[model samples]
Target chain A: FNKITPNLAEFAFSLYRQLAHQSNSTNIFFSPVSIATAFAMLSLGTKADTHDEILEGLNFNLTEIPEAQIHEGFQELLRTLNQPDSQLQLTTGNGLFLSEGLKLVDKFLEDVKKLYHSEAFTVNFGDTEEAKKQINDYVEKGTQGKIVDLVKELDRDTVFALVNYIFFKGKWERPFEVKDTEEEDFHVDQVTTVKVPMMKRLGMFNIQHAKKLSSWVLLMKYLGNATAIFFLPDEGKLQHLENELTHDIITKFLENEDRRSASLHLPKLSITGTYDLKSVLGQLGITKVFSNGADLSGVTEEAPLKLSKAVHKAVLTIDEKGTEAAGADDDEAIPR
Target chain B: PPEVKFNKPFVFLMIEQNTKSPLFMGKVVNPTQK
Candidate 1:
């Protein structure tokens, strides 16, 4: 049921490298799980070559991990994440926006609904502005208004727009006091520094200084089910840390059970990443679907369908409580 | 014994502790950048 997690983790690192390399000292953030799930659903509509390309591009080895296992694994992963009665306010789902005349194959529709828990919406691509508004509104509602205006534009030739969104609000198991937040200087770069509202706390935390990677890793546990790990590298060594980062390295860091009493300072942040998957995925060896020669018959036989544009937006907001209060604001979809 | 500060650019990962599958991963170059 959980065979795909390892592959997802690997893909996360792969996508991060691409986005990080592209950004010039810019913030890099995205929901790897959401983007992967969206593409996996899109794979249902792709031809043999296109389908296999999307799956394999996601770091899945079809030979070893059968196609069915991948979908089943995502299903299980989603179920565990969206489990009710959990203290964490995390919910993720997918949306399939189709052109009015297009009709996805029965099996494709059924499979996406059954496995990915995706909902279908019909839009008139001819009216590009209206279509954009509808998609944006849907995403805004889906993410509880945390994300607004996700779909900025829509190509008239687009046959399908696969949108995936995830919203998470988890309180820190040990939260910092709101009154403790103070304005502090945040070094953005060697030449620039800006004042930011920094939240500080001195307590026992699962923190360790990794010698091999030349970084300090702080594991901040949430009230339930999740933990946020921050990898703070030595001055001017961010690129080196990223170059050496991998799933195995991260796994090893998580294995350290050492606890230490230290003074921690984090900024109250609201960060976001909005990306057009066409360029990013193409760079990640997923060029076939975006090309005009691509085949997407699984989605519809009404016309020669090809993917035109796929936009992914993710938002992460962290305050003193480690939980976002309310209305607020990459590679792989960000808000803070 | 140490004072750790995330005042500069750093990488962050929010993952399911049990599965360790990363839900969000990125580097925060500037927190004010939205």
Candidate 2:
């Protein structure tokens, strides 16, 4: 697991640059860990060139790292992340929604269960609307309602649909006061501005400026074992900052940090991003599984098996106190 | 105290504190826009 984290971080930055370049001025958000884990599980169902492409696309060098090691690394990573915590409600898992009566390889099912700790749901793809709702219902509940409509549409011919989600609700270690929050002007661009409720705090923070990257890095801690690092690029230097910032540069700069008293002002945040990863993964050289004449013998004996669609959606909300909660349990379904 | 504000767009990385494993990454260009 230690060795695989760098590979994960590398893939994270690669995907980040891809999304950032696609839309230069719009807001960006996604869970790299969730997407990578989903692909890793999907690889179990692939074979030959298709299988290798998924692993390589994740920034893992098969020559240097054994294929089994990668899956084991994910297993350990998931185990650590799913551990229960009272203060920090972080729940993450994967779901494999398959077409009804589709006979998948037993090996694939066992591997998914053991390695990915994923749940499998059988759905009738012929009923596209019903199938979409079933898949969305699982993800909606898994994310604690933070992501409600992840799947808006589904193809009738779709055989397999994979989803991964992370729902995190943690209080800030240094919680901002509600009274200090006020409506302030936010510069959307040179000519555009909007009023936003900005939370203000005057306290010590670990902050530094990376001259090479042309950004100011701020490290803020949450109540549990997580941190939120923000990068404020220089005037009109967002593009340069994105291009130059890498995993190594970030790791090194974090070590060269400084703490000082400052007046920090952050806006109340509630953001979500949904993506069609088919194009994005294709650009990263993981196209075989999504194309015709693909070899996915590992998944099932069902001939002509290919990935129809891959979608991922994530949400993050923050306020003066901490994170917010969604719907509570409305039913009294007794559990043993 | 120096003022550190995010009035414009900024990138944010949410990670595990110990492992530096990136959990979520995004840019908030407009906070009001969900």
Candidate 3:
């Protein structure tokens, strides 16, 4: 079961906001199991032997292992993470798992450490000009120049990297043939409706329109348990939507969605972004973990440990595998 | 001298903190009861 604690959810949402403020093409979706495991590691107090205790501390279940194969420890970790429970069960087909997982974890740790221990290290990438240039070249090539200067500096003794990648391709259950898409007014705010292209499909789908406080609550279901709830308010009443966005309301709305078929008209939108989660989480009742006294004794045996930084990135492309996504993370800094 | 029988099934009911609502009900037989 991929359960998400309130702290992790707040942190992830904050990171999402930061990314949304920067790039328009980055869309991110995280596996609750993955983030929970990372949090469990932080709670362990200190890095110790890979045992069942560590897994339990993180709220994860592990399968039994045969004796005499300690050398394949990393492979075992990857295998456990790829299990059905982890929900990151994507087909990588002949892909390298251990190396990629390590690299991702290392990057995330470094970014986290930087945020938590900012006073100890300076952010300067030109300390080693040659290495910096090489890194920049790799970044430029990998993201096709859409992302530049991924790391501003490599000057710190320890760095943390938190990375998440999502690749999703799904055909519309009710295909919107190219001819049905047309430009329409998309309301952005009170007194503002920007002309944008919207995809229209006439098919049976589960949907409901209800009267909310100052807006209309529109709920639509996709394949499976994934559903979209849109809060469309009367012109000049955007704040009503915000007021009604409480946890209880969202939970109730999601729980009450009826599974059926109806017509769906959705705007074709794609966005990508990256950001630091420090300030965002601070505003959301998560000031403790980022503080010096934060206790993460459950992740390792270390006495003094706290969450340092959280970096996240995501992309959403709508086409055919019913909304496919891929995300990864790296935790760079751990007190030795 | 009668046979000392202590094998009756014990029923348990859990009540709410403030209200009179019955939260849960269960039954258990204790073998050690003399």
Candidate 4:
């Protein structure tokens, strides 16, 4: 799991940069952990080139990592994350939503349950609207309503789909006073600034700055075992961070030994981002699975299966107290 | 006499103080106006 986290964070930054580049100055959020876990589970029913592509696309070295070892890592990570604790609420789930009556490969079914603890939901392909609602409903329920209606419209021919979901909420051990919150200017970029309700607080923070990284890193804690890290780039350096910031760059900067008390002002935040990851994953070199000639023969003896859709949605809220964020990733398969 | 003030836009990171596993990453650009 330790090694896999770096891989996951690397993949996440790739996706983040992809989205960040597409838009002008905007906030971007998605659980790369959620998407990678989804793909890891999907990798179970694949073989040959398709199997290798999944791991590579996930930022894993195929020669260095074993398939079974990855599964074991996920299982252990999920077990630790699922443990009940009052300080944090974090849950992740992955499941396949099959077109009504889709069958074959009992082993594939067992792997999802045992490995991912995922359940299969039978959706009526014949009922696109109704089927879409049902799938979204499942994700919403699993993510505790932080995500709603994740699957807006379903491709008519979709049969089997995968949904990876995550939900998290936490509070600061020392809560900020609401009265200290006031309207302030928040710059979107050098030329753009907007008025925002910035909440002020004072606390001990794990903070540092790496001139090479060109960003100020601050780690603030919640009531439980959760922390929100904010990266404030230098003047006109955000675009540079967008281009150069990788998991390694971030990890190196965050290796801060200084812990000091400081006055902090933060905005009370509520935002969300939804993305179509088909193009992003394609750019990441997982193109074959989405094409007709794709070989996903590991799951069934029948049906020409190919990857069809990849959707991701994430929501976040942070205030004087703490933070709440959730994300969902869904992939649908269609016959060529 | 000495103080750290975020009178301008700045970036922040939230993490668990113990094991220090970074949980969420974000930027507060346009905080909703009060």
Q: Which CAPRI tier for candidate 3?
A: incorrect
Which has the higher DockQ value, candidate number 2 or candidate number 3? 2
Query: Best-fitting candidate, measured by DockQ?
Result: 2
Interface RMSD of each: 1.6, 1.4, 29.2, 3.7
Instruction: Tell me which residue pairs clash in candidate 2.
Output: none
Question: What's each prediction's TM-score?
Answer: 0.92, 0.92, 0.51, 0.91
What TM-score would chain B receive for each of the candidates shown?
A: 0.69, 0.81, 0.47, 0.54
- Candidate 3: residue A126 Cα off by (Å): 12
Q: Which stretches of candidate 3 lie over 4 Å from their true place?
A: A1-37, A46-155, A159-170, A190-193, A210-225, A246-248, A254-263, A288-308, A319-336, B1-34
Model 4: DockQ vs. true structure:
0.37
Q: Model 4, A246: alpha-carbon shift in Å?
A: 3.6
Model 4 lDDT tens row, A1-336: 255666766776666666666765556667766787888888888877787788899888857777787777677666666662677888777778887667748888898888888887787877889888888888999888788888777888887888888788788767789999988777665677777777887777666776775877666656666666676677777767656666667666557668777887767778787788888888788878888777777777688688888888878887877788888888888885
Q: Residue A319 deviation, candidate 3, in Å?
A: 4.5
List the DockQ of the predictions in order.
0.75, 0.76, 0.01, 0.37
lDDT of each: 0.77, 0.78, 0.35, 0.72
User: Candidates 1 and 4: which is better by TM-score?
Assistant: 1
For candidate 1, lDDT tens digit of each residue in A142-240? 688888877565666666677777778898999999898999999988789999999998899998887777998899989888888999998777878
lDDT by residue (A1-336, candidate 3, tens digit) is 112222223333333333334433222333332333344434333333323333333323334332122213322332333232222222110111111112233432443343222111222322445434544444344334433554554433332222222222223334567687676655443454455555666655443343564554444333422333444455554434433333334345445546444445555544333445455535433445555555444432324444466543333333323344333333334232
Maximum-lDDT candidate = 2
lDDT of 2: 0.78
